[PDB]
RNA sequence: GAAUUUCUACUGUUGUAGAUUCCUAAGGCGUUAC
DNA sequence: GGGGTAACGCCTTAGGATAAATATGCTAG
DNA sequence: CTAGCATATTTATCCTAAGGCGTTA
């Protein structure tokens, strides 16, 4: 248990961010109110949303006026074309190395263009606010005053767009990441404007086209070296613009392609280049009147002739039989099929008439067709399935009429559920009478002479008709758009540095300080006119009631705090370094990154800091106690005891009536930093951030720090939500939701209100931390964990997580053995109280969620849900590790995908790996005792941090991730798989594949058939042994899927049974014992052939799946070598029971087979953990173990 | 019709049990119903 | 499996999780 | 003319250690 798991603490470090509720105390509310900050941070968070705006503009235009003056050298872009396309030759370092070497180049070019422009020189600092800015919008043609008086309200609070600068940092940047400028210019646009260049080069070349060849600027007249003009934001616009969509060149490929219908020439569509970073109802009265409004417009009073469109429109299509149908015209669209269905009861009746009768080349498809010829048409449609005569006549007009008139005769006609209805019912005759309308002009043609008398007044009164689609957009835009909104307001206090640090000398900067009183936390945000009072405290005496002010004290960066001030301009007179020592700082032979790099110099630079730190009064209060400096192999083991031993808590005594004091003046915002478990009534384990909190001030923990308290802290300001309130009544018994729990009416003293904590307006506080402080350099321990794992064989289990069908997700525990240990369906945890049937609820969940979404009132949620499962199968994977010694196996997302029909989907379960990653980066127990592995201070970490879902490979540590191939459909047993393919429609191959069977005979005793094989002339890959798969298993049938006695179904049916019921129809006799090989070549009857072949299908694969019950088993049709076939039903305890776990088990023999290659190999460092399906194979049939 | 830093399941009784890394910025992709 | 559309969802990446030196506004003069 | 204080704004700049391919559910 826990010696396995021992010595993987303390690995590296981690930051994770705590979040509190600031609740007022005393009079800091009032104070707050009075003064107004909360209504002014919320104006400054809308103007400071205008400025970014606004600075975004300014920097899309510095990028546009300092990217329209860049040359390319030209002469490394031919050598990059020349590697990009010199094929793929191998992997060796001029394919990389020297690509790297021209694309930095590339870069460096572009950078420089950027930087010597005069502005960037004061692009992230204040002059830009100061005087850039107010220019630049004394200079823009539109401008306005309240954007010069938005960027004059942030003349001081520059200090504010720190992190904007930063991030905005990024984009002139040469560096490899996907935040650039240069980066994106020469990894993005530039690769797809050489593909571009290539492949109209060559359809240019090849042969001229059906369509013009765009020779009646223009990029295909100067194409060489356009890229240079490419590279700006109006540039790459103008290159789109030239080939996509209007017309462009790559239009008319795109409209012939269509006629060739050929893969090699839909390649040829040139790709468009990735665009520039950087560039670019009201209420119910409103609805109520609009629908009132149309409805007075429908129906009206029947004023000035019949203008009720509901009535006229239904004489209309009445008149349709009297009215010539040689001119009326009919849609192909899915009106068809609707109309196909309606008429017949097969939607398939005419679209075959017209394609089999009508025409037969392309078949002239055109948008409308004719009423006269689908009326022609049905009259001859081959009589598949009716009367001799059908008395159809004016089929089509007599379906118009008797869906105008005879449907229902209920046409005619502030809740939802009436204006629903009515909406409906007018789409629904909007759409009946949508084929009868003529959409746009000039569609392929046709459009000759109508007929007037119809069609006149049928588009006059279709137009009224046409408002429905935008007052249906309308309605789903303002109708449907959950109670509560998370929205929070970032509050500063009119410090534009506020909490950006808790040190004792940035305090009186940051006005920010922690206090605790009788074990509650509090935090004290000073008013900015008074921020020096916690500089002048009188007294800490101890004999009235005191607060404990924090005391902190920290040298956050030790490379740049150390050069900083010890060679300051106001300090370096003091600490007085020798010329050797300044000589050395500036050549740099103390950084090893340096050429010029001297063991001798870095050790005396290390001992000059050593005796500057010794002088300096702040930092020799830290205590530093340094390891010889002979035994530092670089500066970086200095700087890193530097930082370890640079942190420091203290708690002063402050006395709580000149804290009351201040509180009550208005001097101090005291908040006491709250969470449920801070209550006087909280009694049970308090949550992990609770522990975390109270861990950072620990006596224990800063005898030797692990939790640290990280500055940058945030206050956020939530509004309430939801005004009215859905309150359980007190003394009014309530009945429970669980349905196990004994007791089912529960009567509180006290009201308990749903969603209580959005009605109030609540203060939020964003705590970071740092867990392993001291955490020295140890981010992939996947080296360490091999090593242990090839000398602990006989002492380590395996886990195996599948995500099932019938179960949300599958767990299975093997020992090194094999033999399973542990198997149980995740679908319901079972904790210390109350079990969840979370696949119960999930499902009901389920369908309330469709049943919302169809009449009104959604909700959706379910997300959450299937997420807040996962967090206890993550707790409950954790500990079943901790406990069983185990390392975790599951499926790979990567790289062999499983298929659909799964509860729990593929991005689903990339956030359950992800949450199961980040869950063991960090173990902690919340009843270990805290210096115990696995405690509060001595962590598991039995995983790699979490960087990206591909740059995790085959191994996070203690977990694995396997290939999903093949591990559902083999035996427990001997791993027979299912590698046929019977592949008919081909009569002469049938032959052939049964040719190649070993032995086909009937076995009088067991009652079952013998089909012999070998492995080698199937599945040409040679592996495996022979087979002896019989007839005893898979026993279920589907027999068809669509419709009606065809619908997807399950009959039980004896294979046996149905191979003697096949063979004694063609004389095929097996009673005689023999074998039946040389009796089906006889030919003929291609139906015999093809029945045989699909009851193979229905003998050689052991998954037998039900769309109904838990019925499900993977019976398996071969030999065990001991005379009993692997059946799912009858679980011996150690093989997989249910039809579910045998992807799980099959996933830990995977883990298994890892272990071994881990085991087998001496290369550690390099191990090859990736299985393939050939060596899996062999794996699983171990045979003669 | 159920309390929460926040989420999920609760009533475990002004709360129970287990997850919980927050803010800012850039870009890419995808049902859809227009 | 469908002709040149964005409200909405998903995904990727990046920065930070700082105290102290230094320049500037304001009072004093 | 102007020493001193308070406040806002830019600044200082390590080193490791990487990471890949078996097709198919
Ligand atoms: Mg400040
Ligand atoms: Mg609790
Ligand atoms: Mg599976
Ligand atoms: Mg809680
Ligand atoms: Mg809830």
């Not at 020592?581 to 340096?594: D, F």
């Not at 319901?828 to 499902?843: C, F, G, K, M, V």
């Not at 045998?1142 to 953990?1169: C, F, M, P, S």
Request: hydrophobic content about 30%.
């Amino acid at each position: 248990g826990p010696k396995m798991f021992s010595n993987f603490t303390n690995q590296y470090p981690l930051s994770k961010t705590l979040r509190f509720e600031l609740k007022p105390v005393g009079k800091t509310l009032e104070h707050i109110e009075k003064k107004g900050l909360l209504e002014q941070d919320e104006k400054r968070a809308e103007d400071y949303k205008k400025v970014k705006k606004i600075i975004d503009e300014y920097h899309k235009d510095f990028i546009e006026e300092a990217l329209n003056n860049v040359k390319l050298n030209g002469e490394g872009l031919e050598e990059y074309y020349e590697l990009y396309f010199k094929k793929n030759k191998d992997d060796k370092d001029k394919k990389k190395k020297e690509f790297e070497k021209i694309q930095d180049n590339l870069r460096k070019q572009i950078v420089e263009a950027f930087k010597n422009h005069e502005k960037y020189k004061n692009l992230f600092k204040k002059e830009l606010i100061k005087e850039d800015l107010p220019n630049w919008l004394k200079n823009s043609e539109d401008t306005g005053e309240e954007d010069k008086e938005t960027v004059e309200k942030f003349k001081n609070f520059t200090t504010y767009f720190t992190g904007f600068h930063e991030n905005r940092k990024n984009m002139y940047s040469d560096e490899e990441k996907s935040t650039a400028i240069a980066y994106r210019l020469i990894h993005e646009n530039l690769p797809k404007f050489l593909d571009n260049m290539k492949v109209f080069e060559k359809i240019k070349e090849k042969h001229p086209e059906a369509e013009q060849l765009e020779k009646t600027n223009v990029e295909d007249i100067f194409s060489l070296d356009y890229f240079n003009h490419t590279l700006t934001q109006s540039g790459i616009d103008i290159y789109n613009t030239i080939i996509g969509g209007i017309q462009g060149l790559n239009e008319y490929i795109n409209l012939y392609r269509q006629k060739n219908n050929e893969k090699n020439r839909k390649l040829p569509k040139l790709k468009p280049l990735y665009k520039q970073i950087l560039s670019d109802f009201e209420n119910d009265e409103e609805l109520l009147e609009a629908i009132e409004e149309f409805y007075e417009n429908l129906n009206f009073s029947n004023n000035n002739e019949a203008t009720n469109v509901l009535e006229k429109l239904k004489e209309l299509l009445s008149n349709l039989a009297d009215y010539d149908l040689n001119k009326i015209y009919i849609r192909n669209d899915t009106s068809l099929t609707d109309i196909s269905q309606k008429i017949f009861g097969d939607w398939s009746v005419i679209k075959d008439a017209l394609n089999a009768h009508y025409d037969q080349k392309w078949l002239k498809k055109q948008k409308y067709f004719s009423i006269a010829e689908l009326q022609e048409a049905l009259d001859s449609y081959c009589k598949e399935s009716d009367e001799s005569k059908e008395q159809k006549e004016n089929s089509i007009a007599d379906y118009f009429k008797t869906l105008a008139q005879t449907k229902n005769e209920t046409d005619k006609k502030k809740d939802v559920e009436k204006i629903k209805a009515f909406l409906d019912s007018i789409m629904n005759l909007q759409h009946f009478v949508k084929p009868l309308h003529l959409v746009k002009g000039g569609s392929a043609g046709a459009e000759m002479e109508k007929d007037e008398a119809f069609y006149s007044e049928f588009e006059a009164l279709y137009e009224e008709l046409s408002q429905v689609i935008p007052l249906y957009n309308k309605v789903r835009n303002y109708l449907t758009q959950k109670p509560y909104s998370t929205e929070k307001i970032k509050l500063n206090f009119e410090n534009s540095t506020l909490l950006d640090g808790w040190d004792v000398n940035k305090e009186t900067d940051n006005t920010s300080v922690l206090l605790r009183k009788d074990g509650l936390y509090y935090l004290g945000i000073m008013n900015k006119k008074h921020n020096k009072v916690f500089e002048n405290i009188p007294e800490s005496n101890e004999n009235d009631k005191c607060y404990e002010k924090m005391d902190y004290k920290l040298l956050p960066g030790a490379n740049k705090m150390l050069p900083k001030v010890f060679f300051s301009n106001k300090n370096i007179d003091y600490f007085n370094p020798s010329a050797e020592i300044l000589e050395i700082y500036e050549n740099g032979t103390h950084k090893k990154s340096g050429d010029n790099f001297n063991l001798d110099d870095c050790h005396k630079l290390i001992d000059f800091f050593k005796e500057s730190i010794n002088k300096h009064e702040d930092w020799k209060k830290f205590g530093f106690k340094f390891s010889p400096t002979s035994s530092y192999e670089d500066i970086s083991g200095f700087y890193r005891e530097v930082e370890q031993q640079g942190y420091k808590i203290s708690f002063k005594n402050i006395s709580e009536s000149y804290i009351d004091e201040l509180v009550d003046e208005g001097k101090l915002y005291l908040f006491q930093i709250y969470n449920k478990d801070f209550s006087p009534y909280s009694k049970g384990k308090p949550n992990l951030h609770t522990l975390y909190w109270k861990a950072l001030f620990d006596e224990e923990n800063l005898k030797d720090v692990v939790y640290k308290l990280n500055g940058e802290a945030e206050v956020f300001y939530r509004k309430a939500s939801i005004n009215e309130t859905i309150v359980h009544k007190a003394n009014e018994p309530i009945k429970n939701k669980n349905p196990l729990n004994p007791k089912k009416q529960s009567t509180f003293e006290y009201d308990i209100i749903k969603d209580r904590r959005y009605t109030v307006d609540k203060f939020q506080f964003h705590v970071p931390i740092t867990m392993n402080f001291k955490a020295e350099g140890n981010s992939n321990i996947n080296d360490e964990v091999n090593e242990f794992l090839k000398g602990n064989a006989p002492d380590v289990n395996i886990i195996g997580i599948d995500r099932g069908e019938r179960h949300l997700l599958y767990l299975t525990l093997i020992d090194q053995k094999g033999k399973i240990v542990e198997q149980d369906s995740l679908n319901t945890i079972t904790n210390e109280h109350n079990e969840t049937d979370y696949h119960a609820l999930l499902d009901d969940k389920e369908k309330e969620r469709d049943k919302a979404r169809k009449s009104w009132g959604t909700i959706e949620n379910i997300k959450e849900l299937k997420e807040g499962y996962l967090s206890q199968v993550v707790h409950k994977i954790a500990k079943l590790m901790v406990e069983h010694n185990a390392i975790v196996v599951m499926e790979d997302l990567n790289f062999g995908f499983k298929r659909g029909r799964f509860k729990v989907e593929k991005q689903v379960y990339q956030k359950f790996e992800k949450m199961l990653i980040d869950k063991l980066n960090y173990l902690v127990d919340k009843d270990k005792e805290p210096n115990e592995p696995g405690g509060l201070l001595n962590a598991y970490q039995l995983t790699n941090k979490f960087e990206s879902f591909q740059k995790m490979g085959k191994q996070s540590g203690f977990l694995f991730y396997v290939p999903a191939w093949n591990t559902s459909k083999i035996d427990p047993t001997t791993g027979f798989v299912n590698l046929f393919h019977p592949r008919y429609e081909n009569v002469e191959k049938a032959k052939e594949f049964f040719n190649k069977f070993d032995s086909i005979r009937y076995n009088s005793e067991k009652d079952y058939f013998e089909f012999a094989f070998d492995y080698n002339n199937f599945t040409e890959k040679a592996e495996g042994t022979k087979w002896t798969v019989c007839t005893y298993g898979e026993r279920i049938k589907t027999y068809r899927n669509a419709d009606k006695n065809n619908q997807w179904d399950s009959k039980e049916v004896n294979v046996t049974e149905e191979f003697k019921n096949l063979f004694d129809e063609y004389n095929i006799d097996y009673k005689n014992g023999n074998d039946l090989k040389e009796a089906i070549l006889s030919q003929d009857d291609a139906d015999f052939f093809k029945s045989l072949l699909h009851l193979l299908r229905l003998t050689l694969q052991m998954r037998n799946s039900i769309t109904g019950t838990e019925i499900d088993y993977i019976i398996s049709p071969v030999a065990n070598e001991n005379g009993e076939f692997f059946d799912s039903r009858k679980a011996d305890e150690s093989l997989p029971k249910d039809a579910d776990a045998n992807g799980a088990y099959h996933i830990a023999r995977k883990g298994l087979w890892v272990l071994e290659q881990i085991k087998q190999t001496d290369d550690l460092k390099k191990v090859n953990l990736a299985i393939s399906n050939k060596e899996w194979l062999e794996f699983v049939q171990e045979r003669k173990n």
